C-alpha cells in the first residue's frame, strides 16, 4: 500500500546575481513566484494541495516560518501546512523527497515542494550583551560564511574541501577551468536556444523610480575565457591552489517549486503536463565532512538500486556544480565521462541560490527528458552529505 | 507494505533559564548530550542508526548544518545522515514524525530525532552594506523577536495572538493565572518526587576555572502566588491586556532526543525498554496565523482518527504551555477539562526551548504512561499550525 | 605688550560629496594636504611653526589626537604641539583665533590653524554590553545626527531651529529657494572663471587600480532650478515646512589650513604673500539653542567694536550657508541686503565639512579681498553660538 | 597690556569605577555637578562668567557640543560661550590654560574650565554602508582603544610606549609595583583623613528604585599588596612585560572644574577663597609619539623658565600617574625622586577620567599648597605631548 508520487509541474525564478536584482525581494517572495507558477501549470485545483515544504539554508532575519511565508504570499489557504527544511545545499531536493513521502504514505494526494535563498539578504550576527566582552574589538561573522560556507569540524571554507578532492583524484587547475568555460558556453547556448523559457517564472520587482520584470538569469554572460586562467586561487594560497571564483559556484538569489501528486491526481489533472514524471527513487548518503564533494557518488548507486535501473539507463544527469572539481571527481567514480551531464550549464554559470539549487536542477532536468527516459538530480551538501533522486519522464498515467 | 515505528528511548537536557547555565553551550552541544543519552539507553548498536533529524527554529550563528553538529558531537559515525527541521515550535515533534516515516517506508531500521534551542545564543541581525541606509538611525532586530515570536502577516508578537484567543474563548486573567499557578505547583510536586531523573541527561558545562554539572530544570521554583495577579501584561498595554510573563512560557536553552526503530530492531534490542512505545499516528494542521493557539484542536482529532482511538482512550495529554490561554482554549474546544493534561507541569514552569519543546513533551509523556496506555503530545506553532502524535506505551513488541 | 597676529598662508582641499571621492581619505589626511600647501605658500621655514590647532566636530573612529595626525601626516616635526578643537560648526574659525592668541601673547611666532571633517567616515555607535538591553530591538544612532546635527535640549534636527528662524523673520520657501539658486549660480560662475584655483590644494586619492587627483568641488553643478521648487521639506513634515535638502547645506568631506605669524615673521618672509592679512579682532557670542541661526547677529557687532570699524567699511562678508534661512535672517538684522555676502557661493553649493567650514570661509574671504580692505568671516554653530573674525588685507608690513 | 589670571575655586566629582556608579550619568552631567560646585565656591556672581572650556577626549555619542551641555546642565545662561577641547589626557589642564588666555588678553573677567569623561559610556563604532565590505567578517573598534589608547604611528597600546620607557630608563617590575603600592597607600591615608572632602562635589544618581549620593572615589581600597607582584603584565604578554593593571591607571568616569578670574575679580570676591591661586605660567611640549611618557620632562622646564623659578622653589608636584613607569622616569630625568610628588595618591589608585584628569590633578594640587607656595600640575598625553602649569597658592590679592 506504499503508493507512488508524481511530479506534475516545476518552475524557477531567474537566478539573480549577489547584490543584484533581488536585493529587495525576500527568499519567500521569490518562493511565492515559483509556487504561483508551479500550481498554475499543474492543472490541479489549489484545494487539493495540503502541504508546502521549502528548503532555506540561511534563515536569519527572514522572519517566522519561511516556508509558511512563501505559501501565504503565493495565495495558498492558511489551511495548507508548511515546513522550512535545512539539509544545506541539498535543502531543495530533500524538500521534494519529504513531500513525496506524504503521498507515498497515503497522508496526502497533492503537495508543493522546492527551495529558496536570498544570499544578498543574509545578515551579519551581533551577539547579545551576555556574549559580548566588556571592552575591546568585536568580530561580527557574516551568516554567509559562519552558517553557509564554513565546515565546523575542520575550521575552513568549503573551497578547501574541494582542494582536497582535486588532489586525491588528480584534477588540475586546467581541467577545472576547462569544465567552467564549458559550463558558461552550455549556458549561453541554452539561453540563445531559449531552453529555460517554459520553466522560468518571471519576478516583477517593485521600487521608487520603476517596476522591472526580471525573466533572464544573471551571470552566465560574464565568461572572460582570457581571464579564467589568470584568476588567483580563492581559498588555498600556499602555491598548490587550484579552485578559483572562476571555476566555483557564485552566490545568488533565487527560488524553485514543484507540484507533486498521487497516481489518481496525476490521471485526473496532469496527463498532458510538460514536466510530468514519476519519482522512482530517492537516497541520502554521508561520509567525512572534508569529503562532501564525492558524497553524490555514494548517494547515486543507492538511488539507482532502489529504482532497479543501471547508470546506462539514465538519459540526463544534473549534478550541482558546487566546484568544477566536484563534477570531475564524480564523473571519474561513476564512469560518466560520455554521459549527458549538465548539458544546459550548471551552478558555475547559472548560479547557486543555496536552498533552491536542489529543486532548481530537478526543474532543469525534467524540461530536457524525452518520454520514458530516466533522469538523475544529485546535489552535495556541507558536513559531507548528498541527496540524489531518480525520475522517469512521462506523457501520461 | 507500510511498516510500524517504535520509540525505543528518550532523553532531555535540563531546561536552563535565558542567559543562565547554558550561555556557553551551543544548541547542537546540548543536542549531542540528549542524543548520547537516548542511544545509550536504547540498547541498539550505534551502527544501525542511519539518520539524525533535529528541530531548531533560530539557526543564526549555530554554524553549518546544526543537526549534523549534534550528530558528530554525539560520537555518531560521519556515515549517519542528518537534517535540521523548522516548523517553529513544532520542530522537535515534526522531526520525530519525519524520522518515523523513514522506518514506515522501509528506508531505515533505526533513527534519532528530537530538537534543540539555545535562545541565549540567538544573535541580533545587522544587514550587509547593500540593505543599510546611507545615513540616519538603524534598528537592529533581536532575532528571538523577528524570527521567533513575531507574526509576519499581522505585524505583532505571538503574545497578541494569545490575547485574541483569550477574548474569543472568554478566558480570564484569573483563569490564566490559575492554570499558571497549577503548572508551577505540578512542576514543584514532580521535582520534589524526582519524577524527571530517568529522562534527564545531565550537561557538563566547562566553566571559568572548574566545571559545573547541571541536572535540574531552572525556573520552576519562581512561583510568587501573591504577585501573580499584579504582573503587567507583557504584550498588550491598552487596558485589555491579560497575558503576562507569569502566565506565559519563558525563553530557555535545552535539547531532547529519542531513538526510533523498526519492529525487528525493537524485538532484538529494546524489549522492556523504559520508554518503549509504538508511534500509532501523527497529524499536522493549519488555520489563520492569529488562531495558532487553537490549531492543536484541529490536529488532535485528525491524529485520533488515524490511530482509530477516541479522546477517552488517552490516559495523559502533553500540550505545550506556550501561554495559559493556549491550554484553556484547547481544553474547552476538545472537552479535556477532566482529562489528565500536563500532570507534571509544562512550559510556563519547566521552560520552552522552541526547537526542543515538541520532543521534550514527548519525552515527558513516555515516562508517565503505564503498559498498553495511549498518550497524545500536541504543540502549536507560529504562522497558525500545530502537530499531534499518538503513542501507545509498551512492555515488549 | 599684546602683539598682533597676521595670516600668511591659506589653503583648502576641494569640498568632496558625502560618500564621494574622499570616502577612503581620513579627515586628518585631508588636513595634512591643506597644511602642506599653506606652509609651502607662507614662505616661512617649517621649523618656526611650533603649534597646529585643527577643528574636527565628529571625532569618532578618527584615531588618537586628530590634530596631531594632521600635523604628522603633513610632515611637520614631532616637536610641533597640537590640539583638536570642537565648537561644532565654528570649530575651524575658533582654532585660528586660539592660534592667533599664542602669537598675541608672545608664546609663538608661527602657527598653522584650521579645520577638517570627513562626514562619510563618521561611524554609527554601538553601546557596550552594560548599556544594551538583554533582548529586543536596539537603535544605533548615526552620529552625523546624534553628535552633529541634533539639538540636545529641544530633541530635534538643526533644520527645525532654522524653520523657527524662517517663520519669526518671515523668510518664505521661495525666498530660501531663490538664495539657494543664487548660491549655486555664484559657485558655477566662480568655477567657470576658475576663481578657487589659487586657494585649492589638490588631493591625490590612492585607489585599487591607479591614482586619481581630485582638484574640483563636487556638488555645485547639481542645480536643477525646476526640481528645487518641488522638493519636500526635509525636517518639518506637518505641512508648514520650508527648509529642504536643496535650500540647506550638504554633508561633505574637506579640510582647510592657514599659517599665522608675528609682525617680525610676516616682514622677514611673507611680504606681498597672496593671502597676507592682519587679524584685527575676534568675538564669540551665544543665545538660546533654537536661535543658533541668528547668533552671528550678536557676534559681528562685538567683533566690529573690537576692530573699531563700522558695518559699511567691510568690503566682503563670508557667512556660512548652514541654511538659506540663516543667511537671509542675518541679512535683515545687520542690514547687509545691500553688501557683498558670499560672492563666490557658500555651503549650499560649495558644501559643508563641519569642522573645516569655519577656516574654509576664511580662506575664501582672503582670496577675494584687495589691499587695505576689511573682511569678516562669521559662522553659526549648534547649541546657540557663533564666531566672527575681522581681517584687513595687506600687501606688506 | 597682558593681565594675569587667578584660580578662584576647584571642584571634582568622585572618580567612579569603569562600568560603576556613573554608567547612567553622561560626561556633561558629571561636568555640570563639578561646575555648579566650583561656581558656588568661587563667590563670583554667575553673570560675570562668560565662557565654559571643558576637556573631553571621547566625544562619541555624548551629543552635540559636550562643553555647551555641561554649561546648560550647570544652570549657566545660554549667554555663556563654550568649547570642548581634545589634547587627549592633557585636555582638562589645556582647557584651564585656554580660559586663562581669555583673561590674560582682557577678553573676559571670569571663566569656567575643566574636563569630563565617561569611559563607561564611550561606544563601539560601526562604519556606514560605504566603508563596509560587501561580505566577510567585520571588526568593530571599541573607541576607548581606537580613539583613547591606541598610538596611530606605531600601531600599539599606550601601555607599550610605557614598556619602552620602562626599559630605556631601567625601571623594573619591582620598582613600578613599589610606586603603585605607595600610590594606593597614600590614597588610603588621604581618604582616612578625609583630605578630599573640600574638593569633591557629590553626584546624585537617579535609579529605578531610588536615589544614590556618590561622595567617595572607587578603586583606592582595592590594593592587595600580596597579589600585586603576582599580576600578569596587561600589554606585553610575551614574557618581557612589566606594566600590569595594578601598576597602571584604571579607566574611570568623572569630571573637574575651576572658576578663573581677573586680578580685579579675585580682589572683589575671592580674597580668602580656599583654592585661591595665581596662574604663573603654562607650557605645552611634544616629542616622538612612543616617548609621550617623558614629554612632561620637556614641558616642565619650559613652564618653570616662563615662571622665572627653579625646580627647588616648587613645594608640591602633581604628575598624572598614567603608569608607575611614567612617574619614575620623569622623577629620574628632572631629579625629583626626593621631592613632594603625588602625596595623596594618583591615577593608579584615584582613577583616570581621560578628559577630566588634567584639571582633576590641578584641583588636588591647590588643596595641598600653603600661601606663597608654587605647585606644578604636569600631564603626558597620547601622540608624544604634555602640558605643565605653574601656580602660586595665595590667601589674597
Numbering used by the authors:
A (entry chain B), B (entry chain A), C (entry chain D), D (entry chain C): 36 to 432
Please share text taken word for word from the publication where this structure appeared:
In this study, we have characterized recombinant AfERG10A as a functional acetyl-CoA acetyltransferase catalyzing both synthetic and degradative reactions. Both knockout and inducible promoter strategies demonstrate that Aferg10A is essential for the survival of A. fumigatus. AfERG10A consists of three domains, an N-terminal domain (residues Glu36 to Asn153 and Asn287 to Arg302), a C-terminal domain (residues Ala312 to Asp433), and a loop domain (residues Met154 to Met286).
To provide insight into the structural prerequisites and find potential exploitable differences between AfERG10A and human orthologues, structures of apo- and CoA-complexed AfERG10A were determined using crystals grown from conditions of 0.1 M HEPES (pH 7.0) and 2 M ammonium sulfate in the absence or presence of CoA. In one asymmetric unit, there are four molecules (A to D) forming a tetramer, which is similar to other members of thiolase family, such as in humans, S. cerevisiae, and E. coli. The N-terminal and C-terminal halves have a βαβαβαββ topology and are connected by the loop domain of approximately 130 residues. By comparison, the root mean square deviation (RMSD) value between the apo- and CoA-bound structures is 0.175 Å, with 367 atoms matched, suggesting that CoA binding does not cause major conformation change. Sequence alignment of AfERG10A with ACAT1 and ACAT2 revealed that the equivalent catalytic residues are Cys124, His387, and Cys415 in AfERG10A. To confirm this, point mutations were introduced at the three sites as C124S, H387F, and C415S, and activity assays were conducted. As expected, the activity of these mutation variants could not be detected in either direction (data not shown), suggesting that these residues are essential for the catalytic activity of AfERG10A.
